[PDB]
Amino acid sequence: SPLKVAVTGAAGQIGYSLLFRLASGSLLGPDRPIELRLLEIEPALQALEGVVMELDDCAFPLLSGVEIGSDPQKIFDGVSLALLVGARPRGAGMERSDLLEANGAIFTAQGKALNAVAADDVRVGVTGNPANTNALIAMTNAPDIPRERFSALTRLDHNRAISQLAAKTGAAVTDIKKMTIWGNHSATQYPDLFHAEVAGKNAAEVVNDQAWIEDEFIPTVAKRGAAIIDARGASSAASAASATIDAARDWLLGTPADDWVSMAVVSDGSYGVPEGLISSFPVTTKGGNWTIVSGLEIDEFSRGRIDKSTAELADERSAVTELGLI
Amino acid sequence: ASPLKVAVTGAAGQIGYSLLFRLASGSLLGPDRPIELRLLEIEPALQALEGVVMELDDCAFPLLSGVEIGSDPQKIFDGVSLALLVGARPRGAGMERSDLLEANGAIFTAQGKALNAVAADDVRVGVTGNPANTNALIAMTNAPDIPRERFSALTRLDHNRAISQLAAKTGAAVTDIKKMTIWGNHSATQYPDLFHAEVAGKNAAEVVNDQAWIEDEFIPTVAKRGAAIIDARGASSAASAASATIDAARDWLLGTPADDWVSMAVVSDGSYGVPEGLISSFPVTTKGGNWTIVSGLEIDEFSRGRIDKSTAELADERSAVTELGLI
Ligand SMILES: NC(=O)C1=CN([C@@H]2O[C@H](COP(=O)(O)OP(=O)(O)OC[C@H]3O[C@@H](n4cnc5c(N)ncnc54)[C@H](O)[C@@H]3O)[C@@H](O)[C@H]2O)C=CC1
Ligand SMILES: NC(=O)C1=CN([C@@H]2O[C@H](COP(=O)(O)OP(=O)(O)OC[C@H]3O[C@@H](n4cnc5c(N)ncnc54)[C@H](O)[C@@H]3O)[C@@H](O)[C@H]2O)C=CC1
Numbered sequence: 001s002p003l004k005v006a007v008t009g010a011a012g013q014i015g016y017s018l019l020f021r022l023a024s025g026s027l028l029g030p031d032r033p034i035e036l037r038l039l040e041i042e043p044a045l046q047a048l049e050g051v052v053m054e055l056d057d058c059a060f061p062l063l064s065g066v067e068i069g070s071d072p073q074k075i076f077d078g079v080s081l082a083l084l085v086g087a088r089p090r091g092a093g094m095e096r097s098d099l100l101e102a103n104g105a106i107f108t109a110q111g112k113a114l115n116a117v118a119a120d121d122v123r124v125g126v127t128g129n130p131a132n133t134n135a136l137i138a139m140t141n142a143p144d145i146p147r148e149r150f151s152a153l154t155r156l157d158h159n160r161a162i163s164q165l166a167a168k169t170g171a172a173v174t175d176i177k178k179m180t181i182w183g184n185h186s187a188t189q190y191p192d193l194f195h196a197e198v199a200g201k202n203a204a205e206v207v208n209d210q211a212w213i214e215d216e217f218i219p220t221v222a223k224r225g226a227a228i229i230d231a232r233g234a235s236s237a238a239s240a241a242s243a244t245i246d247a248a249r250d251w252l253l254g255t256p257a258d259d260w261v262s263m264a265v266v267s268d269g270s271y272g273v274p275e276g277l278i279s280s281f282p283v284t285t286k287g288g289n290w291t292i293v294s295g296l297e298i299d300e301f302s303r304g305r306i307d308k309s310t311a312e313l314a315d316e317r318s319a320v321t322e323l324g325l326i
Numbered sequence: 327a328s329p330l331k332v333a334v335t336g337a338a339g340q341i342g343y344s345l346l347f348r349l350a351s352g353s354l355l356g357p358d359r360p361i362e363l364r365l366l367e368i369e370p371a372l373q374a375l376e377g378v379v380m381e382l383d384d385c386a387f388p389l390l391s392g393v394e395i396g397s398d399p400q401k402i403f404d405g406v407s408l409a410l411l412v413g414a415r416p417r418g419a420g421m422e423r424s425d426l427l428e429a430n431g432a433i434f435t436a437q438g439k440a441l442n443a444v445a446a447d448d449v450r451v452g453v454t455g456n457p458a459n460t461n462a463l464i465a466m467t468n469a470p471d472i473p474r475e476r477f478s479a480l481t482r483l484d485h486n487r488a489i490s491q492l493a494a495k496t497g498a499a500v501t502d503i504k505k506m507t508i509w510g511n512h513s514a515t516q517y518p519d520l521f522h523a524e525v526a527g528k529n530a531a532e533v534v535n536d537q538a539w540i541e542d543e544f545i546p547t548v549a550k551r552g553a554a555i556i557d558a559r560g561a562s563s564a565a566s567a568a569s570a571t572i573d574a575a576r577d578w579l580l581g582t583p584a585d586d587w588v589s590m591a592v593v594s595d596g597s598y599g600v601p602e603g604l605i606s607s608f609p610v611t612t613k614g615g616n617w618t619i620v621s622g623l624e625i626d627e628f629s630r631g632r633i634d635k636s637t638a639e640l641a642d643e644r645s646a647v648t649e650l651g652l653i
Contacts, residue, residue, distance in 0.1 A: 011559075016344075016565060017344070017347065017565075019565075020344070020348070020565050020568075020569060021347075021348070021351070024348065024353060024569070026351060046558060047558065047559050047560060049558050050555055050557075050558030050559030050560075051559060051565075053551075053554065053555055053558060054555060054559075054563055054565050054566040055566075056490040056494070057483070057486055057487045057490050057551065057555075057563070057566040057569075058486060058565075058566050058569040058570075059486040059489040059490055059493075059500045059503075060500065061499075061500055061501045063500075156384065159384055159385055159386040160384045160386075162386040163383045163384055163386050166386070167383075172388075172391075173386045173387070173388055173390075174388045176386075224384065227380070228377065228380060228381065228384075231373075231376060231377035231380055232374070232377035232378075232380075232381070233377075236381055236384065237381075238343060238346075238347045238381055238385075239347075239381040239382075239384040239385050241347075242347055242351065242385040242387075243385070
């Protein structure tokens with residue numbers, strides 16, 4: 001039976017990479033058909049028709065059907081996975097608050113729609129920026145969907161961190177395990193080498209260089225989005241779509257034993273992350289359910305960085321509360 | 327498995343951007359066969375290419391064993407077993423499709439020589455850049471030490487587009503559609519052949535039962551699909567062209583299903599009255615990196631007319647690149 005998958009922002013950059021991955025089998029593998037439900041805003045519908053034409057022209061055996069629309073209550077109808085990509089990208093004259101203000105209402109409305117018409121088993125992945133806060137907004141506006149069903153994307157941060165570590169250590173990405181991104185999808189994010197493993201050995205022990213971690217690794221990961229913008233002239237697209245795919249796939253199909261991934265999810269207070277925030281944690285997944293990895297010891301350096309990020313998250317929560325978005 | 331060395335030219339372009347990430351995540355060889363990407367561009371695009379590689383790196387693809395970038399085809403093609411020649415000017419910005427022949431041909435003269443000098447003995451070469459058939463003809467001719475059967479031009483997009491149209495018309499799913507054939511040139515003279523195609527074990531032309539629909543709607547719709555995409559999106563069909571490039575290479579290397587066949591523009595041995603030595607689209611089955619033209623098909627009158635128009639065009643293009651000294 002085809003999985004009903006809603007994708008918002010389907011005519012934009014990320015969408016133009018993502019839809020073809022989805023329809024070709026990148027999400028659930030070669031034996032699981034997919035129904036795509038694509039949401040856009042009015043002046044993009046024509047372009048969306050174009051995208052659908054290309055989808056048709058790929059002759060994808062797993063693509064059971066495509067519906068397009070501009071009403072979230074039509075498109076989210078009975079969907080089991082909602083990928084909320086639609087939102088404006090970061091502009092050059094924008095402060096973070098500018099983008100937060102620009103995009104939040106989207107998630108108020110979409111959270112309400114999901115609450116009204118989504119399938120009982122729905123999982124909701126939020127890619128549109130600011131990811132964490134937009135997920136908080138959607139979650140809060142869908143009180144009849146379990147709060148655990150909402151996750152903001154920090155998987156791009158996670159994969160970027162894996163890439164940087166792999167490059168530094170001369171290891172293959174398949175040798176890198178238990179990478180963690182803590183907190184916000186922003187320049188305050190904390191990539192944690194202290195619980196990661198490179199080819200079976202503690203990553204911090206392998207790289208043996210605190211000054212590298214602080215001066216090169218962390219800010220290269222944290223500011224990689226900006227670096228991509230500078231090198232390419234626009235924010236990440238194909239890699240954001242790939243990260244969206246990885247996160248949703250792992251969420252639905254489960255994480256490898258002896259590994260974990262980064263997902264921004266609602267905090268119950270674990271690791272001193274304020275309750276109610278959407279914050280990136282190390283998690284394992286099984287049967288569509290995530291579990292925050294337990295028993296980790298948080299060193300003083302890591303604690304300082306994590307707190308910096310959660311402080312930023314709390315500020316964002318206050319800001320959207322003031323705007324009346326939640 | 328040891329990483330397959332795959333060259334992709336035009337890597338910083340639109341098709342490239344839609345192609346590389348699917349290649350690196352396993353679309354070509356499946357979940358357990360790593361690949362080494364070797365990416366070729368011209369100098370003004372190298373900076374953009376760096377950005378692309380940044381994104382590739384940021385996907386942390388387990389199958390992507392490594393990436394090399396450069397502008398020297400002798401270096402980038404070194405040891406490759408698959409060369410996907412996507413690099414070439416597209417239509418637009420002062421150029422119509424007919425202008426591409428002279429604009430792009432020399433690329434393939436040069437890359438042909440490069441491949442001849444440095445590619446792995448087992449190399450297969452797929453030409454996407456337009457005009458695809460004639461560019462493949464040029465590449466093949468300038469690589470005399472590589473078997474002629476190793477070169478193929480992409481008609482798989484036409485093929486997939488025709489499958490799409492047929493499935494929509496008949497209310498069938500794409501999995502119902504078998505034995506689609508595109509004959510001839512990847513151009514407006516292409517001939518999508520419903521007479522040998524199947525819709526779930528039924529003759530496709532009979533299922534549609536409407537010769538007027540075939541001639542007046544189906545064929546021109548398939549032919550002009552690129553322009554339709556542009557008119558709708560405001561940008562060209564990069565994702566579906568990338569998808570077709572992947573399909574063709576994948577089926578070439580891994581083989582076609584036993585109940586099916588695909589379209590590939592390959593060198594003609596005179597089969598079906600297609601002048602020898604043209605790179606022309608044929609129905610083919612594939613096994614282990616080799617193609618075989620499907621034999622014994624009865625060519626009806628109408629089909630014959632259309633096929634001959636397309637091969638006539640291909641002959642004129644061959645003559646043109648011969649006059650230009652590209653072969
Ligand atoms: N979390 C992450 O790792 C990353 C997040 N992003 C964010 O993802 C978002 C999308 O980025 P791009 O695709 O590059 O931008 P884009 O502008 O190319 O595409 C956004 C699309 O969303 C559509 N849209 C706007 N409002 C909508 C609504 N209410 N419902 C449905 N669709 C709507 C627009 O019409 C547009 O086509 C941006 O906010 C960007 O900052 C981007 C990269 C990485
Ligand atoms: N056979 C088919 O079904 C299709 C063929 N095409 C053709 O594919 C070609 C590429 O299309 P797009 O990606 O849309 O164009 P594009 O302009 O976005 O990209 C072309 C890229 O090729 C690069 N390039 C030029 N000369 C090169 C050389 N000697 N070596 C390496 N790279 C080189 C350019 O710098 C550019 O980055 C065009 O010729 C287009 O007409 C396009 C769609 C379908």
